[PDB]
DNA sequence: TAAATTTTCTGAAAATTCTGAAAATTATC
DNA sequence: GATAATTTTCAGAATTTTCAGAAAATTTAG
């Protein structure tokens, strides 16, 4: 019982202290207290984290790990489990152990634990071990981590959607204020500007498309105001441009 | 089994976390909803306070003093002494007796609950002390598994507090940054024109004649239009042309008039 | 047994010609198709949505529960039974009477002990559009009956998908039209439309435009120009009654929405 | 043989989901539907319209190379064969080589003496929408094969009917818009519209509206208001270029037609 | 026919988008 | 610093735009 409390404290410090799929590292944390390999999948099937703590046989695993994508079939199979399942044998297709070697670990047992945020399935955790099976304390720890990770996923996803919605509203609000010639100039300049940042000469392109140089300057200022870009004058070397809002080039090409 | 009951209790709290997040609600005692569940699952009285003492949730399921204690619940503020006493403990301290000053039971009525037991758990949402949970029970003691469950509840509540504060901080800072970024793109004459225009408007919205102000401050009429357009781009204002009646303006960003006068 | 199957599939194909011509005021569109399917299968047939809203039915056999007749009248199946059948991914046939997915009343479970039931789900794109329920006294469903059942299931599924896609696209096009209209009104014109249709307080009627214009401090001609810009986009239908005022009729239903927004 | 038939019908039902869209700007949209049908029946399959336009095909087996390839490339079957199959009215199967309705080339008839072919007509709302043609060497079509063939036939028939209904409805909406808009312009506004779009001499461009207004003795406000009435109905897209005039773009293609009328 | 409205057409003050010269800016040598 | 090549600020005008305002034109009841 004391060790259980210690493990819960270990995980509390660990997890609490764009992350580029952090959960992989987080999986290691979950493994340590349970001394087992861990896998984490989303509701769509996209792999979001894994840790091969024990002596695995690489192969498709090495790749599914490298490619950051689990086999579509197994991931779409676990999504319907609804509630927790424990001590699943090796002969079952729901096993975490690679089937390439089922004779190597017949004693292995595996577990599936679903993740739920605000009442919707956010993902699933998978654990696997040998010799002794998962008892209740291990399930307590598993669901502890499940709920914590559920809330972290919900937080990151809500923040990301809010960010993209604000950025898209900004882009639309800005483009709806540009004039005809200003919009043509924006198209021309950002078509010449290969990439999100660089340097170019605005007056030359302005002469190439038949628009007065001041109109282009004013357009770039209307964009700077709404934070879509950040312009800086290089004098005789031209103007330097950097795109801050990422939803801009898409709505422009559209 | 002790472990079986523990697992069942953790599941009972998980199911409420799923549907009762109530993330839209930011009303007085947001977590009190969270407090009720914890009081029931432990079959004990529960209180939730901030590091300063502001009450955020409570449940007097069992027999309480009420006469002198109800004043704290109604005013939603615990006594400064007890809160500053719980602030001294770094880590969890459980099965505290009544003779200790850390007791959750009333000092008015101490002989009514001679065997009463109480537990105190500090809260650290972001590795920083945000508050503390207080539990109180009669005779039945706290074993190890219940401590696991208590710290479970502490950790869950931490992130809800973290979000409640983070959203507003980011929102207000975003509002101020928008105005700063917009004003930093106007030229000297354009900025002077904005100052003149919004001092002449004297309101959150209204109507005026831009050409008149332009002639009054010695700036070309087109510069005012262009400046208001630079503001429209950033969603700071909403301008509408009324032709012979002038221009209509509406201030969307509330941090704008403030950043101008300063 | 196979020739009769082909004949029945052809008999269902033949009726699609006349059934495609539909009237929304019938309140029971697929009912015709339900009768057809009941007839070739000599069985009770029901068609429900994913939520339980009834879309078609036929009482070949006796239900002996005035409680079920009401279900037909109210055009709503019990939410519990619908939520039980909604979980079925694929077709299930020859369902006994003891099962809760049975179409028979719980009053009469021993009254029709041999009764069998079949459930066929309807799908389109990646979502469930509804469900078909078949029920029989003693006689069982064989494989050929299931072939015919799924034939009808697919036909009705795609007809439902088309009707709903048509409705959705129509209303979204109408809403884009309204937005395009308000984006051309001026400040005073937009305020004027608000005033007039708030004073109209209905879907159609008659009023005096000059009075309202004077009441809100706007020139009378501005009202005319705004309402004409609305008529141009087919959003309304205005006609001048001279000294009796103007008559207005709202054609586009998505208009009041863009105003209230 | 009934279970096997049910299995085949279930796999094709599973395939109906995949399409999951209706823009379908493809050269031979039903070609996908043809491929599936070709595989399950292990026979060559062709899908043509009532006029002969090819809509989908799969040449699994040997067919003439030179002249028959032009039918696939040009996407048009010979007028004689199409008008011969349009007369069939009902399904006919196991058609020998001596019949003119044969799917095999008449150049190479001595290569495939036993080849058989089947024709299935497509019907929407009592109208022939097209025809499916199937061809096998030696092996014949049984009753279950016809059940499956007509199963696919009805699906493709309703898909054709839906796409065609959408095309007609779109053009009718476009035609109604121009008349509904022009019926709201006044005399002077109509004169201005005529003058401006005769001056534009094209589908899009730039001009000076005030100049034209003075040139025909009409107030500039009339032109602005008329172009606003047109913008409201999405007939055009105007944008102000200030000192450079007004920019115009014609969205509705039936507009210039109704003006020249 | 006459009141009682609704449309049409004219006028004018203002707003707006664009050209183009004078002034500030950065950079190279 | 000196000079070239840009960027930016600033003044201006042709045009567009919106609204106000009096005829005309239009129904309805008479
Ligand atoms: C279709 C339903 C009315 C049947 C169900 N067994 C009931 O009696 O409620
Ligand atoms: C092309 C075939 C489908 C028709 C006909 N048998 C011919 O050879 O032209
Ligand atoms: Mn006049």
Residue numbers in the entry:
A (entry chain C): 1 to 17, 24 to 260
B (entry chain D): -1 to 260
C (entry chain B), D (entry chain A): 0 to 260
Q: What do the study's own words say?
A:
In Gram-positive pathogens such as Staphylococcus aureus (Sa) and Enterococcus faecalis (Ef), the pleiotropic transcription factor CodY plays a key role in integrating metabolism and virulence factor expression. CodY DNA-binding is activated by two types of ligands: branched chain amino acids (BCAAs, i.e. isoleucine, leucine, and valine) and, in most cases, guanosine triphosphate, GTP. Each 30 kDa protomer comprises the N-terminal ligand-binding domain called GAF (cGMP-specific phosphodiesterases, adenylyl cyclases and FhlA).
Fortunately, the crystal structure of the EfCodY-DNA complex—presented in more detail below—had Leu-bound GAF domains. The EfCodY complex was co-crystallized in the presence of Leu, yet Leu bound only to protomers A and B (dimer 1). In protomers C and D (dimer 2), the residues Glu58-Lys75 involved in the H3-helix shift had overall weaker electron density compared to ligand-free EfCodY. In the crystals, two CodY dimers bind to a single DNA duplex. Leu binding induces the H3-formation associated with a large displacement of loop residues Lys74, Lys75 and Phe76. These residues now reside in the H3-H4 linker forming a ß-sheet interaction with Gly51, Asp52 and Leu53 in the S1–S2 loop—similar to what we observed in SaCodY. Arg66 moved into the position of Lys74 and occupies the equivalent position to Arg61 in Ile/GTP-activated SaCodY, forming a salt bridge with the carboxylate group of the bound Leu-molecule. Importantly, Lys74 in the H3–H4 linker, stabilized by the ß-sheet, now moved close enough to the H1–H2 loop to form a direct salt bridge with the insertion residue Glu26. In EfCodY, the structural changes in the BCAA-binding site are thus directly coupled to changes in the H1–H2 loop—as opposed to via GTP in SaCodY.
